[PDB]
């Protein structure tokens, strides 16, 4: 990836996207539709993925 | 210079529908994402929704939908449509551009206000 | 839904006076919090994102700190156009939703 975004609210967060090693987690934005770099060992990341992953 | 102008305020009776407008300039609806918030006179701010640049519409669970956010591109405007009315509607309504900030939803301008006022 | 909710509801300081107010969440929101200045009859004014961050224009004599569910905005120095009611609103999960208000008044 690169760095990590700081303080980026989850409620911002239109979905996850996780990139095949070129972690690599990036947080498409909804109120400016970018595309940020998030921080994996965030704790409401990792909560996220186990909501997909049906876990 | 970025300036947001409501209109569309007035009375109407309950169970009675009413649209707002919120016409922006100096700035893109297509960049930057709109928010309207209501403020009951003399109560606390309520957010309503949004309305993104790409644009989706994000809206505040506990207003049963009875409100509706669109926008009209090649008018720069967005509009709010109330529909069947309680006098608990009865609101100065504002309308706030986001600042467009990764860190989330921030209202850096804002409108004059309009009121809605619900009587028979 | 996360609920906002301040302390005091009111208060009453002298010109240069510091002042405090609370800002608690229900449930932990990071620190995507922000304050809000309303003048009446005009529309809210943003002065702190991201809790401590100060937006460009307004005054640094304007303070804030906090994070998860307890916050707080600092005056450093009241000054006659402090007179408003300041609302702390919360951008971390949607709805979004402001504090009750805190009511400020100058003592003279």
């Known amino acids: 990836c690169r760095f990590f975004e700081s303080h980026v609210a989850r409620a911002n967060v239109k979905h996850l996207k996780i990139l095949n090693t070129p972690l690599q987690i990036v947080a498409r934005l909804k109120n400016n539709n970018r595309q940020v770099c998030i921080d994996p060992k965030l704790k409401w990341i990792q909560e996220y993925l186990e909501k997909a992953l049906n876990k | 210079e970025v300036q947001l102008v409501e209109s569309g305020g007035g009375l109407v009776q309950p169970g009675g529908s009413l649209r707002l407008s919120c016409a922006a300039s100096?700035?893109?609806?297509?960049?930057?994402?709109v928010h309207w918030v209501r403020q009951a006179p003399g109560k606390g701010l309520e957010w309503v929704g949004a309305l993104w640049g790409s644009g989706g519409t994000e809206y505040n669970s506990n207003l049963k939908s009875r409100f509706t956010i669109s926008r009209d591109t090649s008018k720069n405007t967005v509009y709010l449509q109330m529909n069947s009315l309680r006098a608990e509607d009865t609101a100065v309504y504002y309308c706030?551009?986001?600042?467009?900030?990764?860190?989330?939803?921030?209202?850096?301008?804002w409108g004059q206000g309009t009121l809605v006022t619900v009587s028979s | 839904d996360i609920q906002m909710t301040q302390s005091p509801s009111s208060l009453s300081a002298s010109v240069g006076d510091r002042v405090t107010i609370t800002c608690r969440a229900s449930?932990?929101?990071?620190?995507?919090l922000s304050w809000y200045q309303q003048k009446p009859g005009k529309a809210p004014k943003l002065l702190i994102y991201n809790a401590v961050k100060l937006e460009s224009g307004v005054p640094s004599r304007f303070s804030g700190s906090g994070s998860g569910t307890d916050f707080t905005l600092t005056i450093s120095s009241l000054q006659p156009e402090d007179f408003a009611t300041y609302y702390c609103k919360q951008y971390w999960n949607t709805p979004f939703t402001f504090g009750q208000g805190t009511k400020v008044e100058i003592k003279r």
């Open positions: 449930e932990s929101i990071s620190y995507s």
């Open positions: 100096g700035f893109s609806l297509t960049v930057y994402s």
């Open positions: 706030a551009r986001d600042q467009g900030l990764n860190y989330g939803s921030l209202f850096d301008y």
